[PDB]
Amino acid sequence: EEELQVIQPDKSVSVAAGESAILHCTVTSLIPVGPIQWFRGAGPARELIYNQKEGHFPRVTTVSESTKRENMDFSISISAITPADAGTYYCVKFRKGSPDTEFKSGAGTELSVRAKP
Amino acid sequence: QLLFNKTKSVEFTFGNDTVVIPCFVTNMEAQNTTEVYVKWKFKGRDIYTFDGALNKSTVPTDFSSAKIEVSQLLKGDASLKMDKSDAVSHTGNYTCEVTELTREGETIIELKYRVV
Ligand SMILES: *[C@@H]1O[C@H](CO)[C@@H](O)[C@H](O)[C@H]1NC(C)=O
Ligand SMILES: *[C@@H]1O[C@H](CO)[C@@H](O)[C@H](O)[C@H]1NC(C)=O
């Protein structure tokens, strides 16, 4: 029982417009009970980018085999990137409740979008 | 995610004393009920919740009869049961959301009333 770490190994990712962006995230524990969600930016008006619920995010796809209990990789692939996808992306653990509460967040990964490869 | 054996809708008449809205996770790997959390949603409201960690169930007063069989959770059955009296008043789309440790998923079932 190590006090949970949410680890985004890359501080920044650089991608050409039209390519895919692999945003990496891993956890050291699967407790407490509650899901992993990706946001763009922090604060009240932050945008939800991905969670595991089916067909809610057609642009974002799981890079991990996340259907298995053993899985501790929550890395995602964002397809058909444009400059509008630029910003800081955060991997955030939640505790279950009515409603769910943020438990821990990663340090964030900053996506930048070149015009040409 | 958690994957569901999905049902578009379920019908009930007055023959049905208790109403059952099915919810079956196909890939549950839970050792224990304390790893699992269930949320049943109707019209944006949490109308049933089971916190495995606390081993406690929570309903709003207008869904007082709503419950699940906790005995069946590990099998992957999270089906909601309520008295027909409550069911007739609350027809529509019901979200069943299950969590097991970090794995999360949901499915939608429309509860329909058929006149006989
Ligand atoms: C109502 O009862 C019938 C059996 O008479 C059953 O097949 C059906 O699934 C029940 N409906 C609900 C919603 O419980
Ligand atoms: C339930 O959801 C389905 C699919 O989105 C929709 O066609 C239907 O109108 C909804 N039913 C009610 C009662 O809102």
Coordinates of C-alpha atoms and ligand atoms in Angstrom, one line a residue:
Chain A
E1 CA 0.0 0.0 0.0
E2 CA 2.0 3.0 -1.4
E3 CA 0.1 6.4 -1.3
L4 CA -1.2 6.4 -5.0
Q5 CA 1.1 8.1 -7.7
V6 CA -0.6 9.2 -11.0
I7 CA 2.4 9.5 -13.4
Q8 CA 2.4 11.3 -16.8
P9 CA 6.0 10.5 -17.9
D10 CA 6.2 13.2 -20.7
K11 CA 5.9 16.9 -19.7
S12 CA 5.3 17.7 -23.4
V13 CA 4.3 16.0 -26.7
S14 CA 4.9 17.6 -30.2
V15 CA 2.8 16.4 -33.3
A16 CA 2.1 17.5 -36.9
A17 CA -1.5 18.6 -37.8
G18 CA -3.3 15.4 -39.0
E19 CA -1.1 12.9 -37.0
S20 CA -2.2 11.1 -33.7
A21 CA -1.0 12.2 -30.2
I22 CA -0.3 9.4 -27.6
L23 CA -0.8 11.1 -24.2
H24 CA 0.8 8.7 -21.6
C25 CA -0.4 8.0 -18.0
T26 CA 0.1 5.2 -15.5
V27 CA -1.0 4.6 -11.8
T28 CA 0.8 2.6 -9.0
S29 CA -2.5 1.6 -7.3
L30 CA -6.1 0.7 -8.4
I31 CA -7.6 1.8 -5.0
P32 CA -9.4 3.8 -3.9
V33 CA -12.4 2.5 -6.0
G34 CA -13.1 5.1 -8.8
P35 CA -12.3 5.9 -12.5
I36 CA -9.5 7.6 -14.4
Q37 CA -10.6 10.6 -16.6
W38 CA -8.5 12.9 -19.0
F39 CA -9.2 16.7 -18.9
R40 CA -7.7 19.5 -21.0
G41 CA -6.5 22.2 -18.5
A42 CA -7.4 22.4 -14.8
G43 CA -9.9 24.6 -13.0
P44 CA -13.7 24.9 -13.1
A45 CA -14.3 25.2 -16.9
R46 CA -11.8 22.4 -17.7
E47 CA -12.9 20.1 -20.7
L48 CA -13.5 16.3 -20.3
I49 CA -11.4 14.6 -23.1
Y50 CA -11.8 10.8 -22.2
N51 CA -13.2 8.2 -19.7
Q52 CA -13.8 4.4 -20.2
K53 CA -17.6 4.8 -20.9
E54 CA -18.3 3.4 -24.4
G55 CA -18.9 5.7 -27.5
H56 CA -18.7 9.0 -25.6
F57 CA -15.4 10.1 -27.2
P58 CA -15.1 9.1 -30.9
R59 CA -11.7 11.1 -31.4
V60 CA -9.9 9.5 -28.4
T61 CA -9.0 5.7 -28.2
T62 CA -7.4 3.6 -25.4
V63 CA -3.7 2.7 -26.2
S64 CA -3.8 0.2 -23.2
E65 CA -5.8 -3.1 -23.0
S66 CA -7.9 -1.3 -20.3
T67 CA -10.7 -4.0 -20.2
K68 CA -8.5 -6.1 -17.8
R69 CA -8.6 -5.7 -13.9
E70 CA -4.7 -5.9 -13.9
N71 CA -4.3 -2.9 -16.3
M72 CA -2.6 0.2 -14.7
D73 CA -2.0 2.1 -18.1
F74 CA -4.5 4.9 -18.9
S75 CA -2.6 6.3 -22.0
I76 CA -4.9 7.6 -24.8
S77 CA -4.5 8.4 -28.6
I78 CA -6.2 11.5 -30.0
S79 CA -6.7 11.2 -33.8
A80 CA -6.8 13.9 -36.6
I81 CA -5.0 16.6 -34.4
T82 CA -5.4 20.3 -35.3
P83 CA -4.1 23.5 -33.5
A84 CA -7.5 23.6 -31.6
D85 CA -6.2 20.4 -29.8
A86 CA -3.2 22.3 -28.3
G87 CA -3.1 22.7 -24.5
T88 CA -2.2 20.9 -21.2
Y89 CA -3.9 17.4 -20.7
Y90 CA -4.3 16.0 -17.2
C91 CA -4.8 12.3 -15.9
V92 CA -7.2 12.5 -12.9
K93 CA -8.2 9.8 -10.4
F94 CA -11.7 10.1 -8.8
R95 CA -13.3 8.5 -5.7
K96 CA -16.9 7.1 -6.2
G97 CA -19.8 9.2 -4.7
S98 CA -22.9 11.3 -5.5
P99 CA -21.2 12.9 -7.3
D100 CA -17.7 11.5 -7.9
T101 CA -14.8 13.6 -6.2
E102 CA -11.3 14.2 -7.6
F103 CA -8.7 12.1 -5.5
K104 CA -5.4 12.7 -7.4
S105 CA -4.2 14.4 -10.7
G106 CA -1.0 13.9 -12.7
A107 CA 1.5 16.7 -13.4
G108 CA 0.1 17.2 -16.9
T109 CA 1.3 16.8 -20.5
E110 CA 1.5 19.9 -22.9
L111 CA 0.5 19.0 -26.5
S112 CA 1.9 21.4 -29.2
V113 CA 0.9 21.1 -33.0
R114 CA 3.4 21.9 -35.8
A115 CA 2.0 22.8 -39.3
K116 CA 4.4 20.4 -41.1
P117 CA 6.1 17.2 -40.0
Chain B
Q1 CA -13.7 -0.6 -19.3
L2 CA -16.4 -2.9 -17.9
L3 CA -18.4 -4.5 -20.8
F4 CA -22.2 -5.2 -20.6
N5 CA -24.6 -7.8 -22.0
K6 CA -26.9 -5.1 -23.4
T7 CA -30.8 -4.8 -23.5
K8 CA -32.5 -2.0 -25.6
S9 CA -35.6 -2.0 -23.3
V10 CA -37.8 -4.1 -20.9
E11 CA -41.7 -4.0 -20.8
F12 CA -43.9 -4.5 -17.7
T13 CA -47.7 -4.8 -17.2
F14 CA -49.7 -5.0 -13.9
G15 CA -49.0 -8.8 -13.9
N16 CA -45.4 -7.6 -12.8
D17 CA -45.6 -7.1 -8.9
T18 CA -41.9 -6.2 -8.8
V19 CA -40.1 -4.6 -11.9
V20 CA -36.6 -5.8 -12.9
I21 CA -34.3 -3.6 -15.1
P22 CA -31.4 -5.9 -16.1
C23 CA -27.6 -5.0 -15.9
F24 CA -25.0 -7.7 -16.6
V25 CA -21.2 -6.9 -16.7
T26 CA -19.6 -9.6 -19.0
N27 CA -16.0 -9.1 -17.7
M28 CA -16.3 -8.7 -13.9
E29 CA -13.0 -9.9 -12.1
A30 CA -14.0 -8.7 -8.6
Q31 CA -12.5 -10.6 -5.6
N32 CA -14.9 -8.8 -3.2
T33 CA -18.0 -6.5 -3.1
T34 CA -15.9 -3.8 -1.3
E35 CA -14.1 -3.2 -4.7
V36 CA -17.5 -2.5 -6.5
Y37 CA -19.7 0.7 -6.8
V38 CA -23.1 0.7 -8.5
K39 CA -25.1 3.9 -9.7
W40 CA -28.6 3.7 -11.3
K41 CA -29.5 7.1 -13.0
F42 CA -32.9 8.3 -14.1
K43 CA -33.6 11.8 -15.7
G44 CA -30.0 12.9 -14.6
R45 CA -30.6 11.9 -10.9
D46 CA -28.8 9.2 -8.9
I47 CA -32.0 7.2 -7.9
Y48 CA -30.0 4.2 -6.5
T49 CA -26.3 3.7 -5.4
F50 CA -24.4 0.9 -3.6
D51 CA -21.0 1.7 -2.1
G52 CA -19.2 -1.7 -1.6
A53 CA -16.5 -0.1 0.5
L54 CA -19.1 1.1 3.1
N55 CA -21.5 -1.8 2.3
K56 CA -24.4 0.7 2.2
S57 CA -27.4 1.4 -0.2
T58 CA -28.8 4.9 -0.8
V59 CA -32.2 5.8 -2.5
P60 CA -34.2 9.1 -2.8
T61 CA -37.7 9.0 -1.1
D62 CA -39.6 8.8 -4.5
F63 CA -37.5 5.6 -5.3
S64 CA -37.8 4.1 -1.8
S65 CA -38.5 0.5 -3.1
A66 CA -35.5 0.5 -5.5
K67 CA -32.7 -2.1 -4.6
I68 CA -30.2 -4.6 -6.1
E69 CA -29.3 -8.2 -5.0
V70 CA -25.7 -7.6 -3.5
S71 CA -25.3 -11.5 -3.4
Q72 CA -25.4 -11.5 -7.3
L73 CA -22.8 -8.5 -7.8
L74 CA -19.6 -10.7 -8.1
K75 CA -21.4 -12.8 -10.9
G76 CA -21.8 -9.4 -12.7
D77 CA -25.6 -9.0 -12.1
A78 CA -26.4 -5.3 -11.0
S79 CA -30.1 -5.5 -12.0
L80 CA -32.4 -2.9 -10.3
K81 CA -35.7 -4.1 -8.7
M82 CA -38.5 -1.7 -7.6
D83 CA -42.3 -2.0 -6.6
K84 CA -44.6 -1.6 -9.7
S85 CA -46.2 1.5 -7.9
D86 CA -42.8 3.3 -8.3
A87 CA -42.2 1.9 -11.8
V88 CA -45.4 3.3 -13.5
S89 CA -44.4 6.9 -12.2
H90 CA -40.8 6.6 -13.6
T91 CA -40.9 5.1 -17.1
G92 CA -38.0 6.2 -19.4
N93 CA -34.2 5.7 -20.0
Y94 CA -32.3 4.2 -16.9
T95 CA -28.4 4.3 -16.8
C96 CA -26.7 1.4 -15.0
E97 CA -23.1 2.5 -14.1
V98 CA -20.7 -0.1 -12.4
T99 CA -17.2 0.5 -11.1
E100 CA -14.7 -2.3 -10.1
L101 CA -11.5 -0.8 -8.6
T102 CA -10.5 1.6 -11.4
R103 CA -12.4 -0.1 -14.4
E104 CA -15.7 1.8 -15.2
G105 CA -18.6 1.3 -17.6
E106 CA -22.3 2.1 -18.1
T107 CA -25.3 0.9 -20.3
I108 CA -28.8 2.3 -20.9
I109 CA -32.2 0.4 -20.7
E110 CA -35.6 2.1 -21.4
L111 CA -38.3 0.9 -18.9
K112 CA -41.5 0.8 -20.9
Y113 CA -45.1 0.3 -19.6
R114 CA -47.5 -1.8 -21.9
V115 CA -51.3 -1.5 -21.3
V116 CA -53.2 -4.9 -21.3
Ligands
LIG1 C1 -42.7 -9.0 -16.1 O1 -43.1 -10.4 -15.9 C2 -42.8 -11.2 -17.1 C3 -43.3 -12.6 -16.7 O2 -44.7 -12.6 -16.6 C4 -41.3 -11.2 -17.4 O3 -41.0 -12.0 -18.5 C5 -40.9 -9.7 -17.6 O4 -39.5 -9.7 -17.9 C6 -41.3 -8.9 -16.4 N1 -40.9 -7.5 -16.7 C7 -40.1 -6.7 -15.8 C8 -39.7 -5.4 -16.3 O5 -39.7 -7.2 -14.7
LIG2 C1 -34.5 6.8 -24.6 O1 -33.3 6.8 -25.4 C2 -33.5 6.5 -26.8 C3 -32.2 6.5 -27.5 O2 -31.4 7.7 -27.3 C4 -34.5 7.5 -27.4 O3 -34.8 7.1 -28.8 C5 -35.8 7.6 -26.6 O4 -36.6 8.6 -27.1 C6 -35.5 7.7 -25.1 N1 -36.8 7.6 -24.4 C7 -37.3 8.5 -23.6 C8 -38.5 8.1 -22.9 O5 -36.7 9.6 -23.4

